[PDB]
Amino acid sequence: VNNVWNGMIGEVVYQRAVMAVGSLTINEERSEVVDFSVPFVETGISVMVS
Amino acid sequence: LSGQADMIVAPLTINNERAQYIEFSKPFKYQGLTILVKKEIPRSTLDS
């Protein structure tokens, strides 16, 4: 928000803690700011309907 | 690894040994192996 990152990405970008092991999805803006490693689980957008 | 080089584009595969020398990009596909065999001929047709 207003070019002020928060969350895990914010913590990584503010030099507070390297690495962000967790459930983080690769995107474009994030990859523009904070670079990722190779994906280890494939995923995407999907819908459940009961 | 010679003069040709450039920006090789093909159905390559991301491997440790391959990546130790050249560097890849984010994948543009996802795949497995899925062993393939020839389809069985259905002989159950109630002919006899």
Short mmCIF file of N, CA, C and O in Angstrom, two decimals:
data_model
loop_
_atom_site.label_atom_id
_atom_site.label_comp_id
_atom_site.label_asym_id
_atom_site.label_seq_id
_atom_site.Cartn_x
_atom_site.Cartn_y
_atom_site.Cartn_z
N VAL A 1 0.85 -1.18 0.00
CA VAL A 1 0.00 0.00 0.00
C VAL A 1 0.89 1.23 0.00
O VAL A 1 1.76 1.38 0.87
N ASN A 2 0.68 2.12 -0.98
CA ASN A 2 1.45 3.35 -1.11
C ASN A 2 2.95 3.07 -1.14
O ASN A 2 3.75 3.78 -0.53
N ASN A 3 3.32 2.01 -1.86
CA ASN A 3 4.72 1.58 -1.98
C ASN A 3 5.34 1.31 -0.62
O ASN A 3 6.50 1.62 -0.37
N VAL A 4 4.56 0.71 0.28
CA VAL A 4 5.02 0.30 1.60
C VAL A 4 4.65 -1.17 1.76
O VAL A 4 3.51 -1.50 2.10
N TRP A 5 5.61 -2.06 1.50
CA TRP A 5 5.34 -3.48 1.57
C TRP A 5 5.10 -3.92 3.01
O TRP A 5 5.66 -3.36 3.95
N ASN A 6 4.25 -4.93 3.17
CA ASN A 6 3.97 -5.50 4.48
C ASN A 6 4.13 -7.01 4.43
O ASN A 6 4.61 -7.55 3.43
N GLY A 7 3.74 -7.70 5.50
CA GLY A 7 3.77 -9.14 5.48
C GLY A 7 5.18 -9.71 5.34
O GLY A 7 6.18 -9.05 5.64
N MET A 8 5.23 -10.95 4.86
CA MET A 8 6.51 -11.62 4.68
C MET A 8 7.37 -10.89 3.66
O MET A 8 8.59 -10.74 3.85
N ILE A 9 6.76 -10.42 2.57
CA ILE A 9 7.50 -9.67 1.57
C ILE A 9 8.06 -8.38 2.16
O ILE A 9 9.21 -8.01 1.90
N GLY A 10 7.27 -7.69 2.97
CA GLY A 10 7.77 -6.49 3.62
C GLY A 10 8.93 -6.77 4.55
O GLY A 10 9.93 -6.05 4.55
N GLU A 11 8.81 -7.83 5.35
CA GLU A 11 9.89 -8.18 6.27
C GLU A 11 11.17 -8.53 5.51
O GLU A 11 12.27 -8.18 5.94
N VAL A 12 11.04 -9.22 4.38
CA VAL A 12 12.22 -9.56 3.60
C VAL A 12 12.83 -8.32 2.97
O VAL A 12 14.06 -8.16 2.93
N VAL A 13 11.99 -7.41 2.47
CA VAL A 13 12.51 -6.28 1.71
C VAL A 13 13.11 -5.22 2.63
O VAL A 13 13.98 -4.44 2.21
N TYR A 14 12.68 -5.16 3.89
CA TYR A 14 13.22 -4.17 4.81
C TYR A 14 14.48 -4.65 5.53
O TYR A 14 14.82 -4.09 6.58
N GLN A 15 15.17 -5.66 4.99
CA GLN A 15 16.43 -6.16 5.54
C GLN A 15 16.28 -6.66 6.97
O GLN A 15 17.24 -6.69 7.73
N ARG A 16 15.07 -7.07 7.35
CA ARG A 16 14.82 -7.55 8.70
C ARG A 16 15.04 -9.05 8.86
O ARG A 16 15.37 -9.50 9.96
N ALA A 17 14.86 -9.82 7.79
CA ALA A 17 15.05 -11.27 7.87
C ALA A 17 15.17 -11.82 6.46
O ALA A 17 14.26 -11.65 5.65
N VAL A 18 16.29 -12.48 6.16
CA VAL A 18 16.42 -13.15 4.88
C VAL A 18 15.55 -14.40 4.86
O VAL A 18 15.18 -14.94 5.91
N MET A 19 15.19 -14.84 3.66
CA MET A 19 14.42 -16.06 3.43
C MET A 19 12.99 -15.90 3.92
O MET A 19 12.73 -15.19 4.89
N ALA A 20 12.03 -16.53 3.24
CA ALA A 20 10.63 -16.40 3.59
C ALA A 20 9.91 -17.73 3.43
O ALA A 20 8.84 -17.82 2.83
N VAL A 21 10.52 -18.80 3.94
CA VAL A 21 9.98 -20.15 3.80
C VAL A 21 8.52 -20.20 4.23
O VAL A 21 8.19 -19.87 5.37
N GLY A 22 7.64 -20.60 3.32
CA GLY A 22 6.23 -20.66 3.63
C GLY A 22 5.42 -20.90 2.37
O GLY A 22 5.93 -21.43 1.38
N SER A 23 4.15 -20.51 2.44
CA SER A 23 3.23 -20.65 1.31
C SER A 23 3.16 -19.31 0.58
O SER A 23 2.23 -18.53 0.73
N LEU A 24 4.18 -19.06 -0.24
CA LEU A 24 4.30 -17.83 -1.01
C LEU A 24 4.20 -18.16 -2.49
O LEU A 24 4.91 -19.04 -2.97
N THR A 25 3.32 -17.46 -3.21
CA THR A 25 3.11 -17.73 -4.62
C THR A 25 3.92 -16.76 -5.47
O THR A 25 3.98 -15.57 -5.19
N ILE A 26 4.55 -17.30 -6.52
CA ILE A 26 5.39 -16.49 -7.39
C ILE A 26 4.51 -15.60 -8.25
O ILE A 26 3.54 -16.06 -8.86
N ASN A 27 4.86 -14.32 -8.32
CA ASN A 27 4.11 -13.35 -9.10
C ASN A 27 5.11 -12.49 -9.86
O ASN A 27 6.30 -12.81 -9.93
N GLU A 28 4.63 -11.39 -10.43
CA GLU A 28 5.48 -10.49 -11.21
C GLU A 28 6.00 -9.32 -10.39
O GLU A 28 7.20 -9.03 -10.41
N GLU A 29 5.12 -8.61 -9.68
CA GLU A 29 5.55 -7.48 -8.87
C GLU A 29 6.51 -7.92 -7.77
O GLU A 29 7.56 -7.30 -7.56
N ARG A 30 6.17 -9.00 -7.08
CA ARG A 30 7.06 -9.52 -6.05
C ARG A 30 8.41 -9.89 -6.64
O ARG A 30 9.46 -9.54 -6.09
N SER A 31 8.40 -10.58 -7.78
CA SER A 31 9.66 -10.94 -8.43
C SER A 31 10.41 -9.71 -8.91
O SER A 31 11.64 -9.74 -9.02
N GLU A 32 9.70 -8.62 -9.19
CA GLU A 32 10.37 -7.37 -9.53
C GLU A 32 11.08 -6.79 -8.32
O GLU A 32 12.17 -6.22 -8.44
N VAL A 33 10.48 -6.92 -7.13
CA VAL A 33 11.07 -6.35 -5.93
C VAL A 33 12.03 -7.33 -5.26
O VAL A 33 13.23 -7.06 -5.15
N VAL A 34 11.51 -8.48 -4.83
CA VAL A 34 12.28 -9.47 -4.09
C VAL A 34 12.30 -10.77 -4.88
O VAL A 34 11.25 -11.37 -5.14
N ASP A 35 13.49 -11.21 -5.27
CA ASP A 35 13.62 -12.35 -6.17
C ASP A 35 13.37 -13.67 -5.45
O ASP A 35 13.63 -13.80 -4.25
N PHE A 36 12.88 -14.64 -6.20
CA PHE A 36 12.52 -15.96 -5.69
C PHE A 36 13.54 -16.99 -6.14
O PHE A 36 14.47 -16.69 -6.91
N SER A 37 13.37 -18.22 -5.67
CA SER A 37 14.10 -19.37 -6.16
C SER A 37 13.18 -20.20 -7.04
O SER A 37 12.04 -19.82 -7.32
N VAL A 38 13.67 -21.35 -7.49
CA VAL A 38 12.88 -22.18 -8.40
C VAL A 38 11.67 -22.74 -7.66
O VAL A 38 11.80 -23.10 -6.47
N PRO A 39 10.50 -22.81 -8.28
CA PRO A 39 9.33 -23.34 -7.58
C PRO A 39 9.51 -24.81 -7.21
O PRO A 39 10.12 -25.58 -7.94
N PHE A 40 8.95 -25.18 -6.06
CA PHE A 40 8.98 -26.57 -5.63
C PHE A 40 7.60 -27.21 -5.50
O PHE A 40 7.53 -28.42 -5.26
N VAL A 41 6.52 -26.45 -5.65
CA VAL A 41 5.17 -26.99 -5.70
C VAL A 41 4.38 -26.17 -6.71
O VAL A 41 4.35 -24.94 -6.62
N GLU A 42 3.75 -26.84 -7.67
CA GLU A 42 2.97 -26.13 -8.68
C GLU A 42 1.55 -25.88 -8.18
O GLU A 42 0.96 -26.71 -7.48
N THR A 43 1.01 -24.72 -8.53
CA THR A 43 -0.30 -24.31 -8.05
C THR A 43 -0.84 -23.21 -8.96
O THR A 43 -0.15 -22.76 -9.88
N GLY A 44 -2.07 -22.80 -8.70
CA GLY A 44 -2.70 -21.78 -9.52
C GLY A 44 -4.06 -21.44 -8.97
O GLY A 44 -4.39 -21.81 -7.84
N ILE A 45 -4.85 -20.73 -9.76
CA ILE A 45 -6.18 -20.30 -9.35
C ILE A 45 -7.19 -21.36 -9.76
O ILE A 45 -7.23 -21.78 -10.92
N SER A 46 -8.01 -21.80 -8.80
CA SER A 46 -9.02 -22.81 -9.08
C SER A 46 -10.21 -22.59 -8.15
O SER A 46 -10.11 -21.88 -7.14
N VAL A 47 -11.33 -23.21 -8.50
CA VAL A 47 -12.61 -22.96 -7.86
C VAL A 47 -13.21 -24.27 -7.36
O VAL A 47 -13.17 -25.29 -8.06
N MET A 48 -13.75 -24.24 -6.14
CA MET A 48 -14.58 -25.33 -5.65
C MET A 48 -16.04 -24.94 -5.82
O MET A 48 -16.42 -23.78 -5.62
N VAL A 49 -16.85 -25.92 -6.19
CA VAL A 49 -18.30 -25.79 -6.22
C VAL A 49 -18.89 -27.05 -5.61
O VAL A 49 -18.55 -28.16 -6.02
N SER A 50 -19.75 -26.88 -4.61
CA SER A 50 -20.36 -28.01 -3.93
C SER A 50 -21.70 -28.34 -4.58
O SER A 50 -22.53 -27.45 -4.78
N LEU B 1 27.32 -24.02 -25.74
CA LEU B 1 28.63 -23.68 -25.21
C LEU B 1 29.63 -23.36 -26.32
O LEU B 1 30.84 -23.60 -26.16
N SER B 2 29.16 -22.83 -27.44
CA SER B 2 30.01 -22.46 -28.56
C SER B 2 29.48 -21.16 -29.13
O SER B 2 28.69 -20.45 -28.50
N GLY B 3 29.92 -20.82 -30.35
CA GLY B 3 29.51 -19.56 -30.95
C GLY B 3 28.03 -19.47 -31.24
O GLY B 3 27.46 -18.37 -31.21
N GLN B 4 27.38 -20.60 -31.53
CA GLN B 4 25.96 -20.58 -31.87
C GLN B 4 25.12 -20.06 -30.71
O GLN B 4 24.50 -19.00 -30.80
N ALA B 5 25.11 -20.81 -29.60
CA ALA B 5 24.54 -20.39 -28.32
C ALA B 5 23.24 -19.61 -28.46
O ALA B 5 22.19 -20.19 -28.76
N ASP B 6 23.31 -18.30 -28.22
CA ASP B 6 22.18 -17.37 -28.34
C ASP B 6 21.15 -17.72 -27.26
O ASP B 6 21.50 -17.72 -26.07
N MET B 7 19.90 -18.00 -27.62
CA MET B 7 18.79 -18.02 -26.67
C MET B 7 17.97 -19.28 -26.95
O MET B 7 16.81 -19.24 -27.32
N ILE B 8 18.63 -20.44 -26.87
CA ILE B 8 18.03 -21.74 -27.19
C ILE B 8 16.61 -21.88 -26.66
O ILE B 8 16.35 -21.69 -25.47
N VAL B 9 15.67 -22.21 -27.55
CA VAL B 9 14.27 -22.36 -27.22
C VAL B 9 13.76 -23.67 -27.80
O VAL B 9 13.81 -23.88 -29.01
N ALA B 10 13.29 -24.55 -26.93
CA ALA B 10 12.93 -25.91 -27.30
C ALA B 10 12.28 -26.59 -26.11
O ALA B 10 12.33 -26.06 -25.00
N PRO B 11 11.66 -27.75 -26.29
CA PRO B 11 11.10 -28.45 -25.12
C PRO B 11 12.17 -29.01 -24.20
O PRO B 11 12.23 -30.22 -23.99
N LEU B 12 13.00 -28.14 -23.64
CA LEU B 12 14.07 -28.56 -22.75
C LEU B 12 13.48 -29.00 -21.41
O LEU B 12 12.27 -28.97 -21.18
N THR B 13 14.36 -29.43 -20.50
CA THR B 13 13.95 -29.86 -19.17
C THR B 13 14.92 -29.30 -18.14
O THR B 13 16.12 -29.26 -18.38
N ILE B 14 14.38 -28.89 -17.00
CA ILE B 14 15.18 -28.29 -15.94
C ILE B 14 15.77 -29.40 -15.08
O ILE B 14 15.04 -30.13 -14.40
N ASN B 15 17.09 -29.53 -15.11
CA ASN B 15 17.79 -30.58 -14.38
C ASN B 15 18.96 -29.97 -13.62
O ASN B 15 19.46 -28.90 -13.96
N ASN B 16 19.39 -30.68 -12.57
CA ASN B 16 20.52 -30.21 -11.78
C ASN B 16 21.79 -30.14 -12.61
O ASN B 16 22.47 -29.10 -12.64
N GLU B 17 22.12 -31.23 -13.30
CA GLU B 17 23.35 -31.27 -14.10
C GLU B 17 23.33 -30.21 -15.19
O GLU B 17 24.33 -29.53 -15.43
N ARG B 18 22.19 -30.06 -15.87
CA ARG B 18 22.07 -29.03 -16.89
C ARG B 18 22.23 -27.64 -16.28
O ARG B 18 22.93 -26.78 -16.83
N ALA B 19 21.60 -27.40 -15.13
CA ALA B 19 21.62 -26.07 -14.53
C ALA B 19 22.97 -25.72 -13.94
O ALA B 19 23.23 -24.53 -13.70
N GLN B 20 23.83 -26.70 -13.69
CA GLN B 20 25.14 -26.38 -13.14
C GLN B 20 26.02 -25.60 -14.11
O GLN B 20 26.99 -24.97 -13.67
N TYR B 21 25.71 -25.61 -15.40
CA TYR B 21 26.52 -24.94 -16.41
C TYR B 21 25.80 -23.76 -17.06
O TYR B 21 26.38 -22.68 -17.17
N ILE B 22 24.57 -23.95 -17.50
CA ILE B 22 23.75 -22.87 -18.04
C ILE B 22 22.68 -22.52 -17.02
O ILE B 22 22.45 -23.25 -16.06
N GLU B 23 22.02 -21.39 -17.23
CA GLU B 23 20.98 -20.93 -16.33
C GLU B 23 19.66 -20.84 -17.09
O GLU B 23 19.62 -20.36 -18.22
N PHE B 24 18.60 -21.34 -16.47
CA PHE B 24 17.29 -21.43 -17.09
C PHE B 24 16.47 -20.20 -16.76
O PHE B 24 16.97 -19.21 -16.22
N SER B 25 15.18 -20.24 -17.08
CA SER B 25 14.22 -19.23 -16.68
C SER B 25 13.07 -19.91 -15.95
O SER B 25 13.09 -21.12 -15.71
N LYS B 26 12.06 -19.13 -15.59
CA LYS B 26 10.87 -19.72 -15.01
C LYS B 26 10.18 -20.59 -16.06
O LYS B 26 10.08 -20.19 -17.22
N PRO B 27 9.70 -21.77 -15.69
CA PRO B 27 9.17 -22.70 -16.69
C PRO B 27 7.94 -22.14 -17.39
O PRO B 27 7.18 -21.35 -16.83
N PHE B 28 7.76 -22.54 -18.64
CA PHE B 28 6.54 -22.23 -19.38
C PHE B 28 5.66 -23.45 -19.59
O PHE B 28 4.74 -23.41 -20.41
N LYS B 29 5.91 -24.53 -18.85
CA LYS B 29 5.07 -25.72 -18.89
C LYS B 29 5.34 -26.54 -17.63
O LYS B 29 6.28 -26.26 -16.88
N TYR B 30 4.50 -27.54 -17.40
CA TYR B 30 4.69 -28.47 -16.30
C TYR B 30 4.29 -29.86 -16.76
O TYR B 30 3.25 -30.03 -17.40
N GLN B 31 5.12 -30.85 -16.44
CA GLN B 31 4.94 -32.17 -17.03
C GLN B 31 5.47 -33.24 -16.09
O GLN B 31 6.21 -32.96 -15.15
N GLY B 32 5.07 -34.48 -16.37
CA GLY B 32 5.56 -35.66 -15.67
C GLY B 32 6.20 -36.64 -16.62
O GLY B 32 6.87 -36.22 -17.57
N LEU B 33 6.01 -37.94 -16.40
CA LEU B 33 6.56 -38.95 -17.31
C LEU B 33 5.49 -39.84 -17.93
O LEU B 33 5.49 -40.02 -19.15
N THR B 34 4.57 -40.40 -17.13
CA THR B 34 3.35 -41.04 -17.63
C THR B 34 3.64 -42.13 -18.67
O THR B 34 3.41 -41.96 -19.86
N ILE B 35 4.21 -43.23 -18.17
CA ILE B 35 4.54 -44.40 -18.98
C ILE B 35 3.42 -44.72 -19.97
O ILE B 35 2.24 -44.74 -19.61
N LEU B 36 3.79 -44.96 -21.23
CA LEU B 36 2.83 -45.20 -22.31
C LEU B 36 2.98 -46.60 -22.86
O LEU B 36 4.10 -47.08 -23.08
N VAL B 37 1.85 -47.26 -23.10
CA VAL B 37 1.81 -48.58 -23.73
C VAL B 37 0.73 -48.59 -24.80
O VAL B 37 -0.19 -47.76 -24.80
N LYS B 38 0.85 -49.53 -25.73
CA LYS B 38 -0.12 -49.66 -26.81
C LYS B 38 -1.46 -50.14 -26.27
O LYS B 38 -1.52 -50.98 -25.37
N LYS B 39 -2.54 -49.59 -26.83
CA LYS B 39 -3.88 -49.94 -26.38
C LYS B 39 -4.18 -51.41 -26.67
O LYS B 39 -3.77 -51.95 -27.71
N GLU B 40 -4.89 -52.05 -25.75
CA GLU B 40 -5.26 -53.45 -25.91
C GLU B 40 -6.46 -53.58 -26.84
O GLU B 40 -7.41 -52.79 -26.78
N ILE B 41 -6.42 -54.59 -27.71
CA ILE B 41 -7.50 -54.85 -28.65
C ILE B 41 -8.62 -55.58 -27.91
O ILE B 41 -8.40 -56.66 -27.35
N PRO B 42 -9.84 -55.02 -27.87
CA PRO B 42 -10.94 -55.67 -27.15
C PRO B 42 -11.53 -56.82 -27.95
O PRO B 42 -12.19 -56.62 -28.97
N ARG B 43 -11.28 -58.04 -27.48
CA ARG B 43 -11.79 -59.24 -28.14
C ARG B 43 -13.13 -59.70 -27.58
O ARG B 43 -13.68 -60.69 -28.08
N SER B 44 -13.66 -59.02 -26.57
CA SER B 44 -14.95 -59.37 -25.98
C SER B 44 -16.04 -58.67 -26.78
O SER B 44 -16.41 -57.52 -26.51
N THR B 45 -16.58 -59.37 -27.78
CA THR B 45 -17.63 -58.83 -28.64
C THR B 45 -18.83 -59.75 -28.75
O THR B 45 -19.70 -59.52 -29.60
N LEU B 46 -18.91 -60.79 -27.92
CA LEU B 46 -20.03 -61.73 -27.91
C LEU B 46 -20.23 -62.41 -29.26
O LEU B 46 -21.35 -62.77 -29.62
N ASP B 47 -19.14 -62.57 -30.02
CA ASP B 47 -19.24 -63.25 -31.31
C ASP B 47 -19.62 -64.71 -31.14
O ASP B 47 -20.44 -65.24 -31.89
N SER B 48 -19.03 -65.38 -30.15
CA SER B 48 -19.31 -66.78 -29.86
C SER B 48 -19.95 -66.90 -28.48
O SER B 48 -19.41 -66.38 -27.50
#
